[PDB]
Design an enzyme around this catalytic site. Structure first.
Site, PDB file in Angstrom:
ATOM      1  N   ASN A 100     -17.462  -2.990 -14.011  1.00 35.68           N
ATOM      2  CA  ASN A 100     -17.689  -2.382 -12.705  1.00 35.68           C
ATOM      3  C   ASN A 100     -18.394  -3.351 -11.765  1.00 35.68           C
ATOM      4  OD1 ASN A 100     -18.470  -0.069 -10.699  1.00 35.68           O
ATOM      5  ND2 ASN A 100     -20.456  -0.903 -11.358  1.00 35.68           N
ATOM      6  N   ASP A 167     -20.921  -4.984  -6.798  1.00 31.60           N
ATOM      7  CA  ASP A 167     -19.843  -4.056  -7.121  1.00 31.60           C
ATOM      8  C   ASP A 167     -18.461  -4.641  -6.867  1.00 31.60           C
ATOM      9  OD1 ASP A 167     -19.950  -1.259  -8.115  1.00 31.60           O
ATOM     10  OD2 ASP A 167     -18.585  -0.913  -6.426  1.00 31.60           O
ATOM     11  N   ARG A 195     -15.631   0.249 -24.847  1.00 32.83           N
ATOM     12  CA  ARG A 195     -16.556   1.148 -24.198  1.00 32.83           C
ATOM     13  C   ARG A 195     -16.580   0.695 -22.744  1.00 32.83           C
ATOM     14  NH1 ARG A 195     -22.077   0.367 -21.962  1.00 32.83           N
ATOM     15  NH2 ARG A 195     -23.130   2.405 -22.023  1.00 32.83           N
ATOM     16  N   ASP A 197     -18.355   0.469 -19.634  1.00 29.22           N
ATOM     17  CA  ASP A 197     -19.674   0.613 -19.059  1.00 29.22           C
ATOM     18  C   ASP A 197     -19.606   1.064 -17.602  1.00 29.22           C
ATOM     19  OD1 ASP A 197     -22.716  -0.482 -19.109  1.00 29.22           O
ATOM     20  OD2 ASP A 197     -21.691  -1.003 -17.230  1.00 29.22           O
ATOM     21  N   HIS A 201     -19.215   4.897 -12.011  1.00 25.28           N
ATOM     22  CA  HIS A 201     -19.268   4.053 -10.828  1.00 25.28           C
ATOM     23  C   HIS A 201     -17.927   3.428 -10.499  1.00 25.28           C
ATOM     24  CE1 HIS A 201     -23.485   4.789 -10.762  1.00 25.28           C
ATOM     25  NE2 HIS A 201     -23.519   4.536 -12.058  1.00 25.28           N
ATOM     26  N   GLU A 233     -18.188   5.352 -20.359  1.00 26.41           N
ATOM     27  CA  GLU A 233     -19.580   5.742 -20.222  1.00 26.41           C
ATOM     28  C   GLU A 233     -19.787   6.492 -18.922  1.00 26.41           C
ATOM     29  OE1 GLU A 233     -22.441   3.240 -18.701  1.00 26.41           O
ATOM     30  OE2 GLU A 233     -24.140   4.404 -19.441  1.00 26.41           O
ATOM     31  N   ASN A 298     -28.451   6.378 -27.676  1.00 27.33           N
ATOM     32  CA  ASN A 298     -27.730   5.145 -27.422  1.00 27.33           C
ATOM     33  C   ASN A 298     -28.716   4.048 -27.041  1.00 27.33           C
ATOM     34  OD1 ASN A 298     -28.210   5.419 -24.636  1.00 27.33           O
ATOM     35  ND2 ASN A 298     -26.076   5.028 -24.066  1.00 27.33           N
ATOM     36  N   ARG A 337     -20.580   8.204 -33.182  1.00 27.07           N
ATOM     37  CA  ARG A 337     -21.096   6.850 -33.103  1.00 27.07           C
ATOM     38  C   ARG A 337     -22.547   6.846 -33.557  1.00 27.07           C
ATOM     39  NH1 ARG A 337     -21.520   4.301 -27.352  1.00 27.07           N
ATOM     40  NH2 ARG A 337     -23.226   5.827 -27.250  1.00 27.07           N
TER      41      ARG A 337
END
Ligand SMILES: OC[C@]1(F)O[C@H](F)[C@H](O)[C@@H](O)[C@@H]1O
Ligand SMILES: OC[C@]1(F)O[C@H](F)[C@H](O)[C@@H](O)[C@@H]1O
Ligand SMILES: OC[C@]1(F)O[C@H](F)[C@H](O)[C@@H](O)[C@@H]1O
Ligand SMILES: *[C@@H]1O[C@@](F)(CO)[C@@H](O)[C@H](O)[C@H]1O
Ligand SMILES: [Ca+2]
Ligand SMILES: [Cl-]
Length: 496
Positions: A100, A167, A195, A197, A201, A233, A298, A337
């Site tokens: 991201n 970003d 995963r 992240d 966003h 996520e 986590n 997990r």
């Protein structure tokens, strides 16, 4: 994207947080494979900013500089060696993809990176990718600060900088292609999934456009047409315009409500009781089980850096933690997990850990290798929760009862509950302030079973508690509230 791609029979993944590739490779062969673990979530393998103030914090790995596989965990050769060795023993690798954003916009320009690559946040120049000012959302973001300021505005949450992190303009094909190039590099090496992240966003459609460019898994290990496992996520605890369900078309999502609510229940906060877990799962407002990636804690929230808040249980709360993890691994909801962490000098001041930034065990910045003790525990400050008998044995419990239905539930109206998984497993918990002694229907075939929490089954014998199941499937259970572990678990593979 929804299937873990683990070997048949293996139902969990473990987060070997900040572990070096060479150590993970060895762990795959010496423990994960033999113990039935399905896979490993690795820390971001791409080059990140080297932050010296504070000294090499764990979060520096979430500030990308390039997509070169060069980090404190190792180089590309070491990474490939790890993926190959793990895949060769049936243990998958899932990459923590930081796509991201790049690093903080205020980070100093130079070569303070894990691979020495040059970068200039101020001028939006990342030549090692390469990225330029045209590849960021500077002009798209409409906030006065350029950063995310209000989560009630779904647009700025996606187009503005998360706490200043540059970003990326994920709507641009060039950017989508550079990210796909990185991810395809990893897939071709042998990675089984990712995963994603900071998925909240990112626009669901942008993620999909990127995933659409990804390859099938390496055909030398996976059947033709295998798609990478995708778990996004997304922290959705409710009360926000953005919902985790908005991402179902891309893959699974992290269900942060899981650990937050389980923590409140096991801690008995606000009057919560374990007996309320009877309808655990979607009944608690969670996402559909086939879209859930669950966990107790986590890497973020175990140090008060994520959702769940103070209710999150961690290795610091060993006794309660084992119970929470045990319940999770025994319950059929979602894909599990398990967390594997390192110890750090937790120092609370006014309710906040001033050392929550501390990175992995290290010597002058060099991550320490994972040493194994004679009792199978770890040294060098690695907690290795996945090696705890109570957790490792529950990871196996989940494998043994895979597919079996949730049944034979029992509760005392308080914090003493129990349930089984078809006719392959049974678990009993005592989280009340008094002892538990009662005969319950286990639904298991008659015989003598070893409790895999207090012990193990070794050469036709149990090292801990023994449970005797009668012809009617009934068995007596006794758990003192003073027991090291106030819960008992038995399954088909623990039977004498
Ligand atoms: O649906 C399109 C999208 F995925 O989500 C939003 F519509 C954004 O404005 C757009 O830029 C992005 O590509
Ligand atoms: O996740 C992507 C999405 F949000 O849901 C589905 F994937 C749709 O097919 C796609 O067009 C939409 O943008
Ligand atoms: O605490 C979680 C976090 F560090 O900060 C915010 F919650 C972001 O939405 C999330 O994606 C990120 O991982
Ligand atoms: C995702 O990447 C970040 F940079 C944004 O949250 C880190 O701070 C997070 O810990 C990681 O999950
Ligand atoms: Ca964004
Ligand atoms: Cl996560």
């Amino acid at each position: 994207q929804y299937s873990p791609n683990t070997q048949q029979g293996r139902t969990s993944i473990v987060h070997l947080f900040e572990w070096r590739w060479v150590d993970i490779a060895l762990e795959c062969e010496r423990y994960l494979a033999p113990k039935g673990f399905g896979g490993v979530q690795v820390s971001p393998p791409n080059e990140n900013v080297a932050i010296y103030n504070p000294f090499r914090p764990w979060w520096e790995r979430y500030q990308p500089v390039s997509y070169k596989l060069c980090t404190r965990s190792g180089n590309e050769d070491e990474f490939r060696n790890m993926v190959t060795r793990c895949n060769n023993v049936g243990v998958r690798i899932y990459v923590d993809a930081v796509i991201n954003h790049m690093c903080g916009n205020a980070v100093s320009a130079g070569t303070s990176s894990t691979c020495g690559s040059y970068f200039n946040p101020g001028s939006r120049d990342f030549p090692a990718v390469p990225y330029s000012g045209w590849d960021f959302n500077d002009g798209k973001c409409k906030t006065g600060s350029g950063d995310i300021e209000n989560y009630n505005d779904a647009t700025q949450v996606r187009d503005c900088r998360l706490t200043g992190l540059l970003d990326l303009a994920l709507e641009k094909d060039y950017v989508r292609s550079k990210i796909a190039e990185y991810m395809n590099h990893l897939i071709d090496i042998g990675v089984a999934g990712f995963r994603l992240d900071a998925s909240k966003h990112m626009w669901p459609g942008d993620i999909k456009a990127i995933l659409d460019k990804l390859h099938n898994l390496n055909s030398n290990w996976f059947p033709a047409g295998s798609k990478p496992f995708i778990y996004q996520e997304v922290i959705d605890l409710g009360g926000e315009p953005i919902k985790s369900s908005d991402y179902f078309g891309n893959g699974r999502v992290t269900e942060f409500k899981y650990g937050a609510k389980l923590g409140t229940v096991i801690r008995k906060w606000n009057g919560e009781k374990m007996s309320y877990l009877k309808n655990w799962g979607e009944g608690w407002g969670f996402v559909p089980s086939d879209r859930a990636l669950v966990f107790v804690d986590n890497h973020d929230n175990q140090r008060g850096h994520g959702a769940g808040g103070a209710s999150i249980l961690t290795f610091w709360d060993a006794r309660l933690y084992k119970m929470a993890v045990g319940f999770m691994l025994a319950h059929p909801y979602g894909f599990t997990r398990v967390m594997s962490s390192y110890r750090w000098p937790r120092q609370f001041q006014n309710g906040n850990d001033v050392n929550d930034w501390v990175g992995p065990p290290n010597n002058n910045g060099v991550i320490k290798e994972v040493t194994i003790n004679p009792d199978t525990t770890c040294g060098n400050d690695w907690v290795c929760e996945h090696r705890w008998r109570q957790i490792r044995n529950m990871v196996i419990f989940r494998n043994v009862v895979d597919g079996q239905p949730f049944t034979n539930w029992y509760d005392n109206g308080s914090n003493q509950v129990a349930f089984g998984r078809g006719n392959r497993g049974f678990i009993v918990f005592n989280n009340d302030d008094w002892s538990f002694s009662l005969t319950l229907q286990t639904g298991l075939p008659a015989g003598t079973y070893c409790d895999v929490i207090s012990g193990d089954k070794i050469n036709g014998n149990c090292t801990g508690i023994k449970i005797y199941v009668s012809d009617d499937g009934k068995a007596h259970f006794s758990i003192s509230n003073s027991a090291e572990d106030p819960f008992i678990a038995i399954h088909a593979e623990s039977k004498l």
